[PDB]
């Protein structure tokens, strides 16, 4: 009925704010990106440092794995994305086109495509093999906070400070839906549920919401945590019970019962805003990461 995540590992290495953490699909590795311009690879189970990957000229806001755990795309303030062969650590491609910071990115499940969102208010679709930008979508009238493909790559969802979440048809680049609430607070994060039927979004008014994307109907609502300034990554946790994990500007990691919307746990340990969390694909492991005054990445584990 409740999880009991407890601290197991603290990973130190980044010399400025951490910005995102992601578990490789095969569950072996955790990748992290930082304002210190670096990507770092760590063992997913022992928090043991693997390697450092470099090349970006400015800080990095997001990183993301290909489905086969072998490549990584990163998005940075240097106005580019890079694609990386993880085991060799070489930059396969540099993706050029955005005219300001690239804030978020992701592979499709096929991983022949890459989607990015930028401060320039655009969402772009890139071809992995060539590095070429396939489509540029005029997605928002403010910076784009998150971008994500659904389970089959047919749909992209995107969120923005302009207050909107939009669903796009990958094939045509057509806007299929615009999610409108009552007050349209800046949307600082969005992602699909694993089946791709629902979408989780976070708003800069201390609220996470679960939406039925088709009906365009908000359903569950999760509050209690703190989010009014930073884009905090949130998650569906589904390896044990069913929960919703989010970072929080009160230095805590919050955990919710998916159904009741009640807080079932709050993890103490960090010393600055918890900017990003991730959930292990198979194990009840949660990875968390923090801003400038902490710089550490923590790994927690639970039985439920």
């Amino acid at each position: 009925v409740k999880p009991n995540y407890a601290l197991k590992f603290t990973l130190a290495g980044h010399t400025k704010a951490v910005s995102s953490v992601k578990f490789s699909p095969n569950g072996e590795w955790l990748a992290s990106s930082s304002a210190d311009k670096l990507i770092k690879i760590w063992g997913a189970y022992d928090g043991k440092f693997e390697k450092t990957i470099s090349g970006h000229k400015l800080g990095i806001s997001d990183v993301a794995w290909s489905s086969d755990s072998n490549l990584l795309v990163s998005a940075s303030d240097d106005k580019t994305l890079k694609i990386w062969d993880v085991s060799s650590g070489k930059c396969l491609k540099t993706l050029k086109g955005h005219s300001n910071y690239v804030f978020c990115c992701n592979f499709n499940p096929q991983s022949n495509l890459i989607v990015s969102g930028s401060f320039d208010e655009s969402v772009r679709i890139w071809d992995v093999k060539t590095g070429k930008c396939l489509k540029t979508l005029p997605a928002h009238s403010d910076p784009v906070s998150a971008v994500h493909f659904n389970r089959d790559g047919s749909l992209i969802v995107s969120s923005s400070y302009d207050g909107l979440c939009r669903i796009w048809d990958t094939a045509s680049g057509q806007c299929l839906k615009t999610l409108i609430d009552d007050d349209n607070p800046p949307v600082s994060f969005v992602k699909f549920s694993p089946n791709g039927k629902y979408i989780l979004a976070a708003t800069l008014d201390n609220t996470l919401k679960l939406w039925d994307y088709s009906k365009g109907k908000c359903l569950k609502t999760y509050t209690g945590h703190k989010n009014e300034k930073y884009c905090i990554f949130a998650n569906f946790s589904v390896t044990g019970g069913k929960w919703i994990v989010s970072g929080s500007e009160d230095n805590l990691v919050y955990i919710w019962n998916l159904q009741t919307k009640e807080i079932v746990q709050k993890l103490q340990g960090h010393t600055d805003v918890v900017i990003s969390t991730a959930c292990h694909p198979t194990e009840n492991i949660i990875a968390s990461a923090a801003l400038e005054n902490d710089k550490t990445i923590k790994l927690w584990k639970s039985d439920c």
Binding site: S193, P194, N195, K197, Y198, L219, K220, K242, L258
Partner: peptide, 10 residues
């Protein structure tokens, strides 16, 4: 309000 299945792909 009502149950929601987030993992099932039917």
């Amino acid at each position: 309000d009502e149950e929601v299945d987030v993992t099932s792909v039917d």
